[PDB]
């Protein structure tokens, strides 16, 4: 195949990767930033207190959105292996 | 012109000697085997399916894929020879044509040109007259390239999974947690859910 | 749909049939049957031996090919 | 109709060479050893029990699983062979049927359909008329899928332990501590207290039923 | 007594399964797994070579089988020469000490599982357990025992690692990896207490 | 089971060998009623049976070694 | 060969590698520095803030510059293989 | 010939490892991510055909 | 333009023509065709056997060499 | 042949290794220390911005001193292989 086809395939690949990661990364970032802003405003000098809520938030994300990130990825993979006999050439 | 019986059986046994080479360099065994090895490497499980299991699967898939070619060879070449209708030389010449057509169907013109120019062959009119000594290496090279293409494409979803789990672990501050231990079960789950084995074998068969 | 198992079974049946025919003819000749000659008995036995030797050699080549193919590292 | 003694001996000795292939592609062995190959990965010790110990344990478990099939083959087919009431061809035809049934009950319909379509076979009236060339690779495919399912499910409690230990290590500010070495003894604890080996073998044997 | 040539064939054939006899019937798996887990404990997966660990396990196995070897010599090696018992009655008589040892080292749960895996209902007595049911049960029991011993070995090294990390964190260091600091202390603790000899003594006591 | 069948086969082969050897021994002493052709045929049958046993042992040992060499 | 027939080839190869890796490393460093300076200005105490900006910056840089780096690498490898028969002498 | 055949794959390995570690994910194995890209480079250059051409023209 | 398969085919064909000529000469002598001598028949039969044995030995050497070349660890 | 000759063999070899590796390691260490002290002065703390200039500095180190290393190591190997048949026992 041409390099451009490889670039397009990688493009849909990292698009799916970003769609998978953002539901989790965004909530983790929001929780960390909120806790850090509260800490700076209250002068409670301790970094490790930001770690405990984040996990819960991350876990919350999964239990609220685990199905979707499970399904969409499959809808990609089942396509990719089905496009295998048509990318060669 | 017909070879005597002792010469015929000498040729038959000597040809039976070359069976693995024919399987590897004339059939679809090599591409399936390469893709299976790359897939096994891609799941992070370097020795989960034993080599014998994958070799047997590749052999059965090759037999199924090459069943039309074998049927053509039987109907056109082997059957008249077994009924003494044609000699061994002409039977072999007639049996070469379907296999040659199958190999030409799955070769790349650039590799054929490379081997023709390297062997100093004269201009050849159409695909009808291309020597087997020219077609075999070109077909092997094309099979290698196609197998690597398929394996590299297959490597993508597991790369996505590894990257997303590594990023999720890193954004939590977990600096010294390796992502392979968490990624391997999820790679297995992904391959199971998409019905990976039958889908990949169907894709390999459809590409031929 | 040509199957290799069917061809192997047919070849084994042909070898067995030739061997059985030669054995039956020799048994009948030993029993004093009139219409059987010694030269035919010996020639048929030699032909059966040749066929069985061909079968043995083909089996050896097939086994060598199979053991070479199944010894790969995939 | 019976084969000659020389041909029978030739066929028997030739078929004796396919013993590893038969064991892998026709018996339970493929599902067992593969799971072991994953279990030693879940425990965090790739060394684990030695390879030969796991292989022999899988062999014994396979024999115990196929004891009913072996007994049925011995009764229906091999017993008339020893007692001269059957030929080699008829024995080969008759003894495979219980093993074919055993393979079919663990064969997923999708894989069987895939290999039919790929062999361009005609309409198969019923399970009983499925050719062995179609049942063998489909059984191997379903076997691999089931083994991967069991392995992924096995991977769960050790993932739980690793996550809990890593969260505890990070919540205390001990960020520079690799949690794998700490969590390995606790994985061994989990496998010891719950009697992991006996439970796993019982689960595998029940899974085949 | 059957033919001498058949005896030679059987003897050379049984010679092949010597690794199987060493692994499945003796204790070699237990010592080898204990050594592997102990090596994993110290944090160095290649400090003593695999060859040396295998040979040490072999020597330990030879000593710990010496009583069973002596019983075999009394019941099989000697009377095979005086020809009071020979061939059948003896090979089985000589294997009887192995049966006693493997009954001693096998848990009841594994034997019960492997019996119900073979539909052997009337197995009532405990000295008539067939080899087919006794062997894999013994192997599983050995795996469990080896894992337990490995965890017991793991406990002090895990304690040392945790203590080193805690002192590093309390002293103010948040970036220094504790493994590099704790490795030589793990070694000095292992040598100073003479861990190796007590470990072998406990393994011999562990039967 | 399987060990029992192997033991039975070995016993049958050894009984073959013992019968052939005893017949040849009796014929060596000049005992009547034992013919040379029967002795030779029994010896050859015993040799064939022993060779079959050797071949079966070789195939079984090779299969066991191939099985035990797998990478789990 | 010669130390030079080797040092020059290695220098060209590592120039290719530097050109390939310069955009990603540059955008990563710039994004990390910007986030860190913003964090210090507000006196926010956190260590995991910069990772997500880093990942999106690298992802966007890959999307933007993929064709260029891939074409440069392909051309370099092609000329290397074409010149290989003359490298031996 | 071999030590200069090695060069592009070392380049890819080093670039991927540097990008991964500089980005922060230093716990990933670079070779695992790099192998598909090595295959991509080999297939997009026509590595087999060009390698045969070079080997033939070496004489 | 030299093809080793071509030379192998030529040698195999030459062996075949020698065997066929000897067979036809024996056939004609058996049918009582005047002008054929027994000594020449036996001599040509022995020459055919020598040619076939030479072909057998060449094939054995070539197959052995191919198997030794083809089994090396790359 | 004498153990004094052997141990001298090891020492000189591993001092050659030290001379080969010292410029690169020292350059990396100096770059890391400089970036760390700059971070301390500016009160900036991200663990990734110290990794960026280190690669560039170490790669420049091969540009500048690479020929010297290549000439030193070849001379060492040449002398060792030439003196091989005189330290035989």
Curated annotation (Swiss-Prot), chains A, G, J:
TM region(s), chain numbering: 18-38, 55-75
Cellular location(s): Cell inner membrane; Bacterial flagellum basal body
Keyword Glycoprotein found: no
Alphabetically ordered keywords of this record: Bacterial flagellum, Cell inner membrane, Cell membrane, Membrane, Transmembrane, Transmembrane helix
Membrane topology: Multi-pass membrane protein
Superkingdom as given in the UniProt entry: Bacteria
Transcription in keyword set: no
A Pfam family: Bac_export_3
Task of the protein: Required for the assembly of the rivet at the earliest stage of flagellar biosynthesis.
NCBIfam families: fliQ (TIGR01402)
Family: Belongs to the FliQ/MopD/SpaQ family.
Protein name as annotated: Flagellar biosynthetic protein FliQ
Species the sequence originates in: Salmonella typhimurium (strain LT2 / SGSC1412 / ATCC 700720)
Gene this chain is encoded by: fliQ
Swiss-Prot record, chain D:
Top-level taxon in the UniProt lineage: Bacteria
Annotated InterPro entries: FliP, T3SS_IM_P
Compartments, record wording: Cell inner membrane; Bacterial flagellum basal body
Membrane topology term: Multi-pass membrane protein
Membrane-traversing stretches: 10-30, 53-73, 150-170, 174-194
GO cellular component terms, A-Z: bacterial-type flagellum basal body; plasma membrane
More about this protein: For insertion of FliP into the membrane, cleavage of the signal peptide is important kinetically but not absolutely required.
Purpose: Plays a role in the flagellum-specific transport system.
Stated name of the protein: Flagellar biosynthetic protein FliP
Primary gene name: fliP
UniProtKB/Swiss-Prot annotation, chain F:
GO CC terms: bacterial-type flagellum basal body
Family, similarity comment: Belongs to the FliE family.
Keywords: Bacterial flagellum
GO molecular function: cytoskeletal motor activity; structural molecule activity
Keyword hit for tRNA-binding: no
Species of origin: Salmonella typhimurium (strain LT2 / SGSC1412 / ATCC 700720)
UniProt keyword annotation of Iron present: no
Gene Ontology biological process terms from the UniProt entry: bacterial-type flagellum assembly; bacterial-type flagellum-dependent cell motility
Highest rank taxon of the organism: Bacteria
Main localisation: other
Designated gene of the protein: fliE
Protein name from the UniProt record: Flagellar hook-basal body complex protein FliE
Subcellular location: Bacterial flagellum basal body
From Swiss-Prot, chain H:
Domain of life of the source: Bacteria
Function statement: Plays a role in the flagellum-specific transport system.
Source organism of the structure: Salmonella typhimurium (strain LT2 / SGSC1412 / ATCC 700720)
Remarks, miscellaneous: For insertion of FliP into the membrane, cleavage of the signal peptide is important kinetically but not absolutely required.
Localization annotation: Cell inner membrane; Bacterial flagellum basal body
Transmembrane region(s): 1-21, 25-45
Protein's name according to its UniProt entry: Flagellar biosynthetic protein FliP
Shown stretch of the complete protein: 185 to 243 of 245
Family under the similarity heading: Belongs to the FliP/MopC/SpaP family.
Name of the encoding gene: fliP
